[PDB]
Write a protein that binds this DNA or RNA. Structure first.
Ligand SMILES: [Mg+2]
Length: 49
DNA sequence: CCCTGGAGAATCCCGGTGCCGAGGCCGCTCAATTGGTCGTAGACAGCTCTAGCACCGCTTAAACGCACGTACGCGCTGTCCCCCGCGTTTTAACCGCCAAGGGGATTACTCCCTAGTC
């Protein structure tokens, strides 16, 4: 869920982010899309919307 | 047979800080006092009248003892069934998020209402 899990979370294993739906303001979108590539992402993170 | 040391847990209780509202203070304010009237209704007899206090002697109708007797409230036995304490799950309000009107005030342009003198 874009709210319960959209805030600070340390997922690193996945290298791809999928945005099934958009949520108005882009702040939450950027918070969601940065839950994978934060520090330990050793591979390029691909984001699809 | 039944009593309890220990333990689990609910109670009583006063620190101990934050809050919102009980009470005080301020500014109107309207209704109880008070002058009178004038006439209304109840206190004061008064005549009346009407039901009750006590009395008399009966009359068996109820009231009470005695004896039989007998069955039911209560206390004994047993089982059984069903509701509670606890553990797990799901409705149930409440508070945040967003983009759009509604509108109420709020101020800007302006435009007619107002009023002066060569
Ligand atoms: Mg953080």
């Amino acid at each position: 869920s874009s709210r319960s899990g959209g805030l600070g979370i340390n997922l690193t294993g996945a290298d791809t982010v999928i945005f099934y739906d958009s949520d108005w303001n882009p702040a939450m979108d950027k918070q969601c899309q940065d839950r994978c590539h934060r520090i330990g992402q050793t591979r390029d993170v691909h984001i699809y919307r």
